């Protein structure tokens, strides 16, 4: 049933997730999230293949060469939330 929940807000999604937790539906949560993932959006997202692609993109951007990058290396909250290989590589770059 849950996958059909008419979520819109952030809270709606968090509710869904909370129910996936409460019932232990990691495959469901993984799917819901997959639906959410589908530049800023990509940054927010940062399955294995996708992560690899994101890594490659980051590398390309670095070779070509802001807040997100600093966080990887309001702000405190972001650092707390952040607290993977692709990410580490981008941070190194």
């Amino acid at each position: 049933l849950l996958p059909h929940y008419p979520f819109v807000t952030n809270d709606d999604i968090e509710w869904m997730l909370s129910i996936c937790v409460e019932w232990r539906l990691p495959e469901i949560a993984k799917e819901i999230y997959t639906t959410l993932g589908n530049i800023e959006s990509i940054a927010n997202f940062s399955l294995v293949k996708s992560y690899s692609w994101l890594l490659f993109e980051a590398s390309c951007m670095e070779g070509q060469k802001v807040l997100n990058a600093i966080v990887s290396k309001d702000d405190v909250i972001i650092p707390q939330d952040i607290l993977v290989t692709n990410s580490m590589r981008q941070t190194l770059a």
Partner: antibody
Amino acid sequence: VQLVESGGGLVQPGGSLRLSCAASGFNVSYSSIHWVRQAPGKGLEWVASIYPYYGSTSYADSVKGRFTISADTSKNTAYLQMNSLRAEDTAVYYCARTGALDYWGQGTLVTVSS
Amino acid sequence: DIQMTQSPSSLSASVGDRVTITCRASQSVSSAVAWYQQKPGKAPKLLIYSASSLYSGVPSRFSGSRSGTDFTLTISSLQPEDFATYYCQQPITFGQGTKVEIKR
């Protein structure tokens, strides 16, 4: 979705007021609550914010040491305790949230005088 | 503390006119800039976030753009209901506001 602000009004200078902002329709626990004030005929002034996630708080220079922002995630309610109030603090006070500032309090008027 | 300077502080424009309000950051902020509309006697209402993202439900005549440290709020076709003070925002700081009136 709605922020609610109560507890302003008339207050003697040097006095004190606790403002409440009761939230609903959103995740208080991962939001940031800000207080922004507007003095008669003037622009908006951000005074304080709190992270409900980390409990981190911060303040504009103009209110530091006199104003305390706090938050109770378990009743989805945030607070601004205003001590040693001054004529300079007379203003409509708005609570607002971030997950920019998408959700705004209807505002409550604080008038400070003797 | 960061200062946000709006130009002009006041303007008059006819219905159907295109209106441009600019905001210049004291130092270099990043696209972390929002635009609001405030009617007198009421809470500000979010218009634009992240410099150029249109907040949900807001009429498409409102748009935001960035050129370096200059931020632009544009109203493509001014409506009579659009009179207000508009504010940019990046401590969090607000611009001083731009008052928009209808010319007759």
